Amino acid sequence: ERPTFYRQELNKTIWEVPERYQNLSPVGSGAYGSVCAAFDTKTGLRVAVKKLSRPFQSIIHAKRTYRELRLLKHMKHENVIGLLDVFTPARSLEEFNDVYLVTHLMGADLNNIVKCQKLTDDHVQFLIYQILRGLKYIHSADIIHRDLKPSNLAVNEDCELKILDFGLAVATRWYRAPEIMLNWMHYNQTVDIWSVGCIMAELLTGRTLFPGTDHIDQLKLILRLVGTPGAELLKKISSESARNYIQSLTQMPKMNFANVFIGANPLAVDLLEKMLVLDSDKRITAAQALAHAYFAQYHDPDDEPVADPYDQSFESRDLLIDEWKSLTYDEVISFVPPP
Numbered sequence: 001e002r003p004t005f006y007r008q009e010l011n012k013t014i015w016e017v018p019e020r021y022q023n024l025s026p027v028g029s030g031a032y033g034s035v036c037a038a039f040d041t042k043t044g045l046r047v048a049v050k051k052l053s054r055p056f057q058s059i060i061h062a063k064r065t066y067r068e069l070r071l072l073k074h075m076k077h078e079n080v081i082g083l084l085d086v087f088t089p090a091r092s093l094e095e096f097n098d099v100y101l102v103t104h105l106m107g108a109d110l111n112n113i114v115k116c117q118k119l120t121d122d123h124v125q126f127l128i129y130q131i132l133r134g135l136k137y138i139h140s141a142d143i144i145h146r147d148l149k150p151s152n153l154a155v156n157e158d159c160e161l162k163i164l165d166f167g168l169a170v171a172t173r174w175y176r177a178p179e180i181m182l183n184w185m186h187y188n189q190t191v192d193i194w195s196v197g198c199i200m201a202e203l204l205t206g207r208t209l210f211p212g213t214d215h216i217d218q219l220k221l222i223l224r225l226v227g228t229p230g231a232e233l234l235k236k237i238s239s240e241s242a243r244n245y246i247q248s249l250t251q252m253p254k255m256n257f258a259n260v261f262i263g264a265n266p267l268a269v270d271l272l273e274k275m276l277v278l279d280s281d282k283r284i285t286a287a288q289a290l291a292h293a294y295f296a297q298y299h300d301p302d303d304e305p306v307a308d309p310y311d312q313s314f315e316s317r318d319l320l321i322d323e324w325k326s327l328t329y330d331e332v333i334s335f336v337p338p339p
């Protein structure tokens with residue numbers, strides 16, 4: 001039946017969780033939610049418990065809540081966050097006002113690793129391999145992460161990496177594809193490969209590749225490496241004023257990456273070239289990057305799985321808060337823990 005719950009206040013926040021979850025201490029807080037570390041007595045594992053903030057107080061919050069539960073319930077991959085539990089104190093839908101999501105506790109992110117050691121090439125290989133493996137899986141479900149950066153990549157003592165979203169309220173713009181910042185209205189998956197490129201570069205050199213101070217600086221820093229748009233790419237911009245603006249800048253040539261990333265594995269350099277192309281249609285995909293000779297030690301085409309079909313049709317619906325709430329509630333109730 002239903003577990004026995006208990007109540008406590010942590011930081012002017014009520015946490016009402018099943019008894020199984022003990023030793024709650026706050027680790028993160030913000031507009032989106034708050035998180036406590038906890039011990040799961042049933043399994044012996046340390047867990048993160050995320051309580052959504054105001055999950056049904058607005059239409060946008062209500063859809064986000066549903067969006068996040070659905071996505072997390074779907075992700076079943078070693079290199080992506082998985083859901084251990086989801087629960088509510090509510091005994092009925094008419095009572096339903098709070099949602100808590102439980103996953104493995106992940107205390108260290110890739111950002112921590114990159115500050116605190118200079119990585120071997122085998123170390124870069126393993127980490128980048130695992131990011132592309134999770135992304136291949138995420139991209140197969142027609143999900144775009146949009147915010148890949150070191151602080152959204154958990155890494156454990158054993159160097160095993162999981163993609164998630166740690167955010168609850170390392171500038172995002174440093175890792176962002178040039179078209180996101182251009183407000184290109186219809187961008188795609190390949191934006192995530194730009195980010196992987198930036199993270200891989202930083203793993204090789206130990207420093208941010210493009211530490212822009214704003215969006216304009218960001219773009220300048222990008223063009224110094226990859227060059228001003230060519231003829232073919234200028235064609236894919238139908239705006240004349242954009243083209244004339246770009247043509248009126250000091251033209252930057254493309255740098256040879258092998259000349260920039262000095263002393264990196266030539267294979268890593270070649271892979272980087274394929275990731276950090278301005279024209280997103282030319283970027284290497286996650287599935288393709290996995291088969292690149294840089295990962296010969298890791299690649300197994302038979303252990304790089306794709307997602308089950310993911311029904312995302314809700315994204316295009318405009319619904320009432322209590323419709324989003326009832327749907328979220330169906331998802332809480334139907335949840336089956338992993339073994």
Ligand SMILES: Cc1ccc(-n2nc(C(C)(C)C)cc2NC(=O)Nc2cccc(Nc3ccnc4ccc([N+](=O)[O-])cc34)c2)cc1
Nearest residue numbers: 027028035048050064067068081101104105106163164165
């Ligand atoms: C509205 C929305 C929709 C989806 C997501 N989302 N998306 C994804 C992808 C599948 C694409 C990677 C993942 C997420 N959400 C997500 O990761 N949520 C999510 C769910 C439970 C716990 C957490 N945080 C944490 C997990 C594990 N150790 C942690 C340790 C510390 C902290 N800390 O100090 O703040 C947070 C932790 C994140 C996030 C927000």
Ligand SMILES: CCCCCCCCO[C@@H]1O[C@H](CO)[C@@H](O)[C@H](O)[C@H]1O
Nearest residue numbers: 178179186187188236278279280281
């Ligand atoms: C100021 C420097 C110019 C940067 C140009 C970025 C080119 C982005 O690449 C573009 O992304 C679009 C969005 O998916 C695609 O539809 C286009 O096919 C692709 O060329």
